[PDB]
Specification:
Chain B: It comes from Homo sapiens (Human). This is part of a larger assembly, with chains A, B, C and D. In chain A, about 30% of the residues lie in helices and about 15% in strands. Chain A has helices at about 25-45, 70-75, 85-90, 120-135, 150-160, 180-185; strands at about 5-10, 50-55, 60-65, 105-115, 135-140, 170. The longest helix of chain A has 18 residues, at about 25-45. In chain A, α4 packs parallel to α5. Chain B is α/β, with parallel strands linked by helices. The longest helix of chain B has 17 residues, at about 290-310. Chain C has helices at about 5-20, 20-30, 115-125, 135-140, 155-165, 185-200, 230-240, 285-295, 305-310, 315-330, 340-350; strands spanning about 40-45, 55-60, 65-70, 145-150, 170-175, 205-210, 250-255, 270-275. Chain C has a five-stranded parallel β-sheet with strand order 5-6-7-4-8, with helices on one face. Chain C has a three-stranded antiparallel β-sheet with strand order 1-2-3, with no helix packed on it. The longest helix of chain C is centred in the C-terminal third of the chain and has 17 residues, at about 315-330. The chains are: A alpha/beta, B alpha/beta, C alpha/beta, D alpha+beta. Chains B and C meet through α1, α2, β1, α3 and α8 of B and α1, β3, α4 and α7 of C.
């Protein structure tokens, strides 16, 4: 089958609990993680999935493992503190990709961003240049918004994404009554 | 509509929080199991005994099996209990010592000629406090080699400071066949009038009739006081009757005054047997409730029978 | 219900515990399966000055004394000076304590798988196994000690033995001289061991006989051989008085002669029921004889008058002996069916 | 709390092993291991320990990598074979 590693980042902030959009969509995207990890389990059960947040202090809840049994139990106690962090959130994952068991597995990291980026364009294009240098697949997913959806983020993705052929895809979800599951299941990255 | 949802959620959260008691209680036991498993990690300890000691730091030990050895001193224990004359413990490795191994109104007179039940009172006190649990048999002789046994029992009595002695039916031993008996009596005199502290240890004697009881041995010296019990007290009899009337339901109109007054020269356990016999007599009528009339009649008849069999 | 959402995590931790105890509960079976020998355990309370003082005294069958505290799983019937305990190599710990008694031999004594008075007797022996559920509301306390006596020639032994078959429980046999031995201090050990077996086993039936001969207080002051069963009986009464466990399985006692009686035997736990036998009738003996002989083949014509009249001061075992004797010559008579005259013939034969 | 501790040469020799199995990397940064001992008694006593992979970042100093699963597994098996020793703390070979 397909050999790759899956890294999912969840937003522990209070912006996910807002009353306009979904009623604490954290559980919804949790169910998304569940159905996509069960999908990967059905396809290639030998894949491991790690879990960490975007907050200031990076704390791994569960190390990468093929068994999601205890992971489902570790999906709780999100510890709703902090706001957002980007750079070290990347450096705690992409640099930690070398701690995986199988060396034949491809590097794949996604993210759930529910908060505005505090970092300027410089750090963005630099980190994008780094990820492009080490050649790691990155899928940008943003749940909820305040300011304009894509402004510098477009150029960010374009500069971050190399190998136009069968490369990474950008996921942009607008406001709506529908869930995020079938919406993030639309690209080829899911299933 | 919004008011009922609070109650519903209260019910769901209720049954959600009521299922923890079937787990969190036994989780402590499950943890205690592994705690014991970690408590079994200490093994390989042996024993020893100290006779002669030269060096204060290191002494000589004596095993039970008979080989003799020598050990050192652990930094934990001190020289306080390190002194000789105390059995200690040893380890199979390095022969260290974890710990040591420890070895294991001055009188009253009760005469019972009118009936019995003194043993019930003694049992009441024994069940109350008694300060300890000890019993002395009437005749330790048949068990002249019993003298060292008596001295051994008294040695244990000197070993444990608090003591209370209960002796039932002492009229049997109170009576070359007689010569050895007199010798045993002389031994008893020698032991009781010897050097001992009686201000703590207490002795109680139960018997039947004042004949073989040796009034000379009933003397103030070998026995401070004498208490005669004819029968349980009126308040005591009423109380025990009330607590015996607890499990058994009766008619709305009840009088214990007749039961107490009509009872003369009777005993608690015996009266209880009379009550049970009255219940088994009244169970023949297969009624759920029993009047005191049948109770009074049955009690009267049975007690009369006990008076006829009192010989 | 947002505050109750944290309960799920707790339940996950609990089921995780249940999942992680599998191994440590698994090693128990393979570790504790085979104790290599048997050692004697004696409980001795020590003092450490938690840090609570705890210790024990061990005796190996190889006569080598070691040192060890009190450990193992939750204990209930343990801590008693018993035997047969589980032990591993060099560990000398305690895992499984089973009591087989001491010097077993006394215990394996035996293995067993008049209407108005026998009615009261049957009701008396049945009620403790029956009315216990009704004893809560009625508050009726069942008698323990029961004294069955009477004039010689009654046959009460095999009668009570016959009632034992009606009790459907296990029956035991203990006599008077069985309590008298060459050794000394056997009484306490015998009583404690018997009560231990009575504690461990089912509510069986215990019946002792000849309590009058071994309970003689010997008014004559010169000499006699046995003072032991006297204090054994005193200790028995003591344990039947000052002990709460006495509510457990009853012990039935019987005396042949009324010449010797102890006034201290009167109590609920002690001897309670007293029934004197006033020259038992004939027709009743004929009835129980009919019940005993109903299995054998007999010509169904009996007057019963001759057999009822010819029986005077005879036991039940003697009546059964009359039946057996009647079956003895019936074999050499050539008849395949027992007759009426064979009964009285047997009576005049053996008696 | 603790007046003095006891450190056995075995753990430092395990650090010698850390300098052994390197196999000429070209990185050789600080390595964080897991120290084991007895916290029950007042005085700390070190018996043995194990090793866990630890990596950092060149520029950003806030990057630290540990493993919960490997730690729980190693400590689990170590507790399984020996119940006389538990977790206490960690150590690093970094001079600064």
């Amino acid at each position: 089958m397909v050999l790759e590693s899956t890294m999912v980042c969840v937003d522990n902030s209070e912006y996910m609990r807002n009353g306009d959009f979904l009623p604490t969509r954290l559980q919804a995207q949790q169910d998304a993680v569940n159905i996509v990890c069960h999908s990967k389990t059905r396809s290639n059960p030998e894949n491991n999935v790690g879990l960490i947040t975007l907050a200031n202090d990076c704390e791994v809840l569960t190390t990468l493992t093929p068994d999601t049994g205890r992971i489902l139990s570790k999906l709780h106690t999100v510890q709703p503190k902090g706001k957002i962090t980007f750079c070290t959130g990347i450096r705690v994952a992409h640099l930690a990709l070398k701690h995986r068991q199988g060396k034949n597995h491809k590097m794949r990291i996604i993210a759930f961003v529910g908060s505005p980026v505090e970092d300027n364009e410089k750090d963005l294009v630099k980190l994008a240049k780094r990820l492009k240098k080490e050649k790691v697949n990155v899928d940008i997913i943003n749940f909820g918004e305040e300011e304009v959806n894509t402004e510098k983020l477009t150029a960010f993705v374009n500069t971050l994404n190399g190998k136009d052929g069968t490369g990474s895809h950008l996921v942009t979800v607008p406001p709506g009554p529908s869930l995020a599951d079938a919406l993030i299941s639309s690209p080829i990255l899911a299933g | 509509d919004y008011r009922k949802k609070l109650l519903e959620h209260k019910e769901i959260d209720g049954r959600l929080k009521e299922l923890r008691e079937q787990l969190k209680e036994l989780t402590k036991q499950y943890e205690k199991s592994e705690n014991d498993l970690k408590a079994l990690q200490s093994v390989g300890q042996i024993v020893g005994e100290v006779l002669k000691q030269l060096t204060e730091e290191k002494f000589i030990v004596k095993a039970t099996n008979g080989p003799r050895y020598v050990v050192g001193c652990r930094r934990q224990l001190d020289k306080s209990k390190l002194k000789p004359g105390t059995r200690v413990a040893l380890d199979m490795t390095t022969l260290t010592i974890m710990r040591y191994l420890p070895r294991e109104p001055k009188g009253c007179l009760l005469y019972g000629p009118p009936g019995t039940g003194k043993t019930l009172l003694a049992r009441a006190v024994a069940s109350q406090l008694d300060c300890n649990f000890l019993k002395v048999v009437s005749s330790s002789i048949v068990d002249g080699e019993s003298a060292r046994l008596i001295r051994e029992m008294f040695n244990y009595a000197r070993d444990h400071q608090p003591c209370i002695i209960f002796m039932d039916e002492i009229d049997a031993i109170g009576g070359s066949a007689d010569r050895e008996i007199q010798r045993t009596l002389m031994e008893l005199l020698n032991q009781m009038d010897g050097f001992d502290t009686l201000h703590r240890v207490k002795m109680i004697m139960a018997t039947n009739r004042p004949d073989t009881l040796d009034p000379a041995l009933l003397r103030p010296g070998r026995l401070d006081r004498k208490i005669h019990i004819d029968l349980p007290n009126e308040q005591a009899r009423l109380d025990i009757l009330k607590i015996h009337a607890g499990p058994i339901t009766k008619h709305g109109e009840i009088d214990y005054e007749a039961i107490v007054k009509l009872s003369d020269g009777f005993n608690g356990a015996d009266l209880r047997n009379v009550c049970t016999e009255a219940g088994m007599f009244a169970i023949r009528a297969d009624h759920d409730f029993v009047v005191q009339e049948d109770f009074m009649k049955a009690v009267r008849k049975v007690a009369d029978s006990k008076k006829l069999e009192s010989k | 219900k947002i505050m109750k959402s944290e309960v799920l995590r707790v339940t996950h931790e609990l089921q995780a515990m249940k999942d992680k105890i599998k191994e440590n509960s698994e090693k128990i079976k393979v570790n504790k399966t085979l104790p290599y020998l048997v050692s004697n355990v004696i409980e001795l309370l020590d003092v450490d000055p938690q840090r609570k003082g705890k210790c024990a005294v061990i005796k190996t069958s190889t006569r080598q004394t070691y040192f060890l505290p009190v450990i193992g799983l939750v204990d209930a019937e343990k801590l008693k000076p018993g035997d047969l305990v589980g032990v591993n190599k060099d560990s000398y710990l305690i895992l499984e304590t089973l009591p087989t008694e001491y010097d077993s031999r006394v215990k394996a004594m035996e293995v067993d798988e008049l209407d108005k008075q026998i009615q009261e007797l049957v009701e008396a022996i049945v009620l403790p196994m029956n009315h216990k559920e009704k004893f809560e509301n009625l508050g009726i306390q069942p008698p323990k000690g029961v004294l069955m006596y009477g004039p010689p020639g009654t046959g009460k032994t095999l009668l009570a033995r016959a009632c034992a078959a009606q009790t459907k429980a296990t029956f035991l046999k203990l006599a008077g001289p069985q309590l008298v031995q060459m050794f000394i201090g056997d009484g306490a050990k015998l009583v404690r061991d018997a009560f231990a077996l009575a504690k461990e086993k089912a509510p069986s039936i215990i019946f002792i006989d000849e309590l009058d001969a071994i309970g003689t207080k010997r008014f004559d002051s010169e000499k006699a051989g046995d003072r032991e069963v006297q204090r054994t009986m005193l200790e028995l009464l003591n344990q039947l008085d000052g002990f709460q466990p006495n509510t457990q399985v009853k012990v039935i006692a019987a005396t042949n002669r009324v010449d010797i009686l102890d006034p201290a035997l009167l109590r609920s736990g002690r001897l309670d029921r007293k029934i004197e036998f006033p020259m038992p009738n004939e027709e009743a003996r004929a009835r129980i004889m009919q019940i005993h002989s109903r299995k054998m083949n007999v010509s169904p014509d009996v007057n019963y008058e001759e057999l009822a009249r010819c029986t005077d001061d005879f036991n039940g075992a003697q009546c059964k002996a009359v039946c057996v004797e009647a079956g003895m010559i019936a074999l050499r008579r050539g008849a395949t069916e027992l007759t009426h005259e064979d009964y009285m013939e047997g009576i005049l034969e053996v008696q | 709390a603790v007046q003095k501790v006891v450190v056995h040469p075995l753990v430092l020799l395990s650090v010698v092993d850390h300098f052994n199995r390197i196999g000429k990397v070209g990185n050789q940064k600080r390595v964080v291991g897991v120290l084991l001992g007895s916290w029950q008694k007042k005085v700390l006593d070190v018996s043995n320990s194990f090793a866990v992979p630890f990596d950092e970042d060149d520029k950003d100093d806030s990057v630290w990598f540990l493993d919960h699963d490997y730690l729980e597994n190693m400590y689990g098996m170590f507790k399984k074979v020996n119940a006389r020793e538990r977790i206490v703390g960690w150590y690093h070979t970094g001079p600064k």
